[model samples]
Target: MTDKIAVLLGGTSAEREVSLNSGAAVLAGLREGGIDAYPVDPKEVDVTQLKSMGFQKVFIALHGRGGEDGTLQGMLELMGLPYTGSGVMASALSMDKLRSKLLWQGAGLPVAPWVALTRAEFEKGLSDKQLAEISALGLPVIVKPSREGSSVGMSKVVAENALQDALRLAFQHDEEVLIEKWLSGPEFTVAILGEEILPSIRIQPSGTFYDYEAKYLSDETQYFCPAGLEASQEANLQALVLKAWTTLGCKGWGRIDVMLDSDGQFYLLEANTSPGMTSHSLVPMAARQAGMSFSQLVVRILELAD
Candidate 1:
């Protein structure tokens, strides 16, 4: 009998639509690679039925909240089924940007300066001291929901009056929000498949920042595969990304985003255990540069499944 693989996607998260697209791409890739893969939306189907349905493995194409945040991973673990990407603890930590940054900082990695706020604190009204602390990071801060991906519930606040609204916007998606000091210019993402780190891709958004529009919609956003960096610079970035991935205890395939300051210093942003596989996605782009086709990449990821 052929191996049956379930491509879990489209959960009840803000990234549902994106996940659906990713699942479609992954399902097609897996099939093209000669694997018996099927699309399974957790919103409509009970994942608990997967084992009874004779599914042997899972390729997690779900993003955000219930899917990427370890809830589904824990369920699969209890069912004694192997799935792609990081396990429960790493997924939980990667899903929460605040905790991920704290862990990186503790590991002696360089991350952007950030201040975290909770709904409880916001409900009591942001204190003057807290506002001052945020202000200390300087002007033009990036506000984002601590648990969201695909740039949902994120804003670039350029003014003091806009700060409160930005926090509220992020709080709508998650109870916790992060106010990070904006790192100007030349954003890049590193894709990791098993122990190998793919080439870094430089992101140049046509807009103010790499917001939701630039990520999934806009055609104006530019991506450089080689990232126009010196060989030494790229090697250093790859090393940092691998170190960050290992520190988070991430396994299988994942992506790490970072920013380069004017002084050529790189700061870690966040990790994505289940990154998008859409046409505009970066992982596939980098993989192609590494001489791997989409089908080959998907097969390689499945080969690494625990």
Candidate 2:
């Protein structure tokens, strides 16, 4: 008998559209792999409603704020339901950039120099004060909301004039905004399925930076498989990724973004527990490089859950 699986999506989050796309892709892949897959938008779902639906397991495709941040995961935990991706603590930690970096630093992971500021600091027009702190790390910094995904309210500021606006906009999304020193390097993303680390994917976007628009809406962005890394470098990077994954206590499937600097040093951006699984998402794209079809990847992730 095919197992009934519910793929949750469309939560009340800034990244709702991306979540919907991820949910659809996951549902389609699960069905293609011969599982009884059904899509449920969490915006229209509750624990009681889920019990009535009678799903044996769940594949979470929700992203951003309420869904990705341990809130939804905690709900599933309380319901005693088997779900994919990291547990509540890990998911929540991963969603918050400020906290994630703290854990990363504690775990001896390399992180770009960054400063976390609150809305009070931003609204007080402490741009010079913030810049003084950030300048200690250097210029050409990236600013974004601490708890947001999909590049929502993200800004890459090259000069002093853009820094305040970037901080303000990022603060608009969340009170905690992170200003990170820009590490000049090539960006790479790794997808971890269980204990296996898939091939690395290089993200090359058309714009000077890859914002929300370039990530989901634009077609000019290109992804490179195997990431052109040498065998030794690839192995080291993969090992570091798995280390980060385990350190974060992630489960099933997840993705980590990294910046490989000119010196070949890898700086961890952050780990994504319930990353986007859209047809064109990074995980699926990397899985294909590992000889796993989209359907195979979906089933593999499901198998990892209890």
Candidate 3:
């Protein structure tokens, strides 16, 4: 229990800023909980040296590709070190938006209708059948990079003419892009800490959607922890989120994003392996609703590591 901890953060991913904030907050919280924790930015230090440095465990705070996508976890496993969050397969599968949806769909779960477009397809230009399939999803679709996070290359295509530019932007981030039918309903993010699912947090973004600005920069965004849902509704949502999480093979702890669509159906959107931990992050919000302090949640998360 007194083992020294390395809080990994601030990687080369596009989410470095948010990861740094989350990592810094986690480091402080762990120390407050009386744990020996230190910040280890993978961008500036070699995580392979953690064993020699006498660090007994790792708290993965890094988000996006290099960290949350399982590469770093793969390395940690090679070094025979215990780390937080999901394993390599789960991390990689969930980081991929398209693959995550496919798995959820195959499991008989609800997910938005989507059209997958790889760089090869884009390069050859979308065939008529592909374009028709995309059209089948309808206008005002949400286009996003499959492997990126934090909505880095997300776009709302309100018009058919704007599709090409949006695809171009998304392809800039990753070779694979997803054009999914936009869910017109309230968004909820559920956090899992160990075997228990934390209280659901409903996100009410004042902007077009919970984009990068609405998530990190906008002060107008509103979040309801208890979410004003009837007891049964909330329980169902938690159950759905848990199913969505497990279907993807996620373990340890993570967050699942879902939406209640226009037809009053809950659909799985995406999964976050290593969710944000900033002062304004959703997991922290949900933890508070469960009557746990940030430090307690941090300590509890570390306890679940390995």
Location of the lowest summed lDDT over 10 successive residues in candidate 3: 125-134
For TM-score, the strongest prediction is 1
lDDT of 2 at 113: 89
lDDT of each: 0.92, 0.84, 0.90
lDDT of 2 by residue, 18-51 (tens): 9999998988898899999888887876744665
Model 3 residue 243 CA deviation in Å:
1.2
Leading candidate by lDDT: 1
Q: Give every collision pair in model 1.
A: none
Write the residue-wise lDDT of candidate 1 on 59-140 in tens digits: 9999999898879999999988889899999999999999999999999998998899999999999899898989998788
Query: Model 3 scores what on Cα lDDT?
Result: 0.90
Residue pairs in collision within model 3: none
Tell me how far the alpha carbon of residue 221 in candidate 2 is from the true structure, in angstroms, after superposition: 1.5
TM-score of each: 0.98, 0.95, 0.97
Q: Lowest lDDT 10-mer window, candidate 1?
A: 1-10
Query: Over the stretch 1-306, how does candidate 3's per-residue lDDT look in tens digits?
Result: 549899998999999999999999999899999999999998989877888888888999999988999788998898888899999999999999998988899998889999999999899888877778888888789999999878799999986789999999999999999999989989988999998998888999998878888889888999997777888789888888888888888888899888998898888889999999986799999998899998999899888888
Model 1 bad stretches (over 4 Å): none
Better of 2 and 3 by TM-score: 3
